[PDB]
Structure 1
Amino acid sequence: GSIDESRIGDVHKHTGRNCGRKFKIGEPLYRCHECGCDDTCVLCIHCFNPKDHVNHHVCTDICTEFTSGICDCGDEEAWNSPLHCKAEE
């Protein structure tokens, strides 16, 4: 077999558990009007999968110092539809 060590690999994969990545200032936060339960359900850049949200109203935000957030990818009580983590691609 042959793997390339330079690749991002699987450092962002979180199969079976929630992502819970903490947003640092400047990073994008993704929210979907159709998929998210309340206006606090968010996805990180590594998780957000455009495929899941074709025809949906996606809202992007820049993370600030006042942003206290962790990624909700894989927490099934935060989403109306099952998501497909991008890190799995």
Structure 2
Amino acid sequence: VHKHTGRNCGRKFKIGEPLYRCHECGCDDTCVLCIHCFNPKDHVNHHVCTDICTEFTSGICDCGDEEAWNSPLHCKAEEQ
């Protein structure tokens, strides 16, 4: 359902929705992952922070956009 094989996720966050950042994996502070995409197995000993999309905040999940990540990601939605 949340699978996006061959392309980026690009899910636009809604108010109150959680999002993920990894200090090690993100190219900068703005690189984020939705809950359907964030895979714990990609960030075992990494520094991960969960945030919440506010009224004052907007944008999209970067899962599958290689420009956003220092390391290749393994999308959670791909797992069976």
TMscore range, shorter length: over 0.9
Per the alignment, in what secondary structure is the counterpart of residue 87 of structure 1? helix
What is the rounded CA distance, in whole Å, between the counterparts of 1:64 and 1:14 in structure 2? 25
Shift of 1:19: 0.3
Q: What are the superposed Cα offsets for residues 7-52 of structure 1, whole Å, 9 maximum, x if unpaired?
A: xxxx210001000000001111100000000100000000000110
Q: Percent identity?
A: 100
Figure out how many residues of one structure are paired with residues of the other and give that number.
Answer: 79
Shift of 1:62: 1.1
What is the rounded CA distance, in whole Å, between the counterparts of 1:53 and 1:17 in structure 2? 21
What is the rounded CA distance, in whole Å, between the counterparts of 1:40 and 1:31 in structure 2? 8
Ranges of 4+ aligned residues in structure 1 off by more than 3 Å: none
The unaligned stretches of length 5 or more in structure 2 are none
Give the TM-score normalised by structure 2. Answer: 0.96
The unaligned stretches of length 5 or more in structure 1 are 1-10
Give the TM-score normalised by structure 1. Answer: 0.87
Q: How does 1:1-89 map to 2 (within 5 A)?
A: 11-89=1-79
What is the rounded CA distance, in whole Å, between the counterparts of 2:59 and 2:18 in structure 1? 11
What is the rounded CA distance, in whole Å, between the counterparts of 1:19 and 1:42 in structure 2? 11
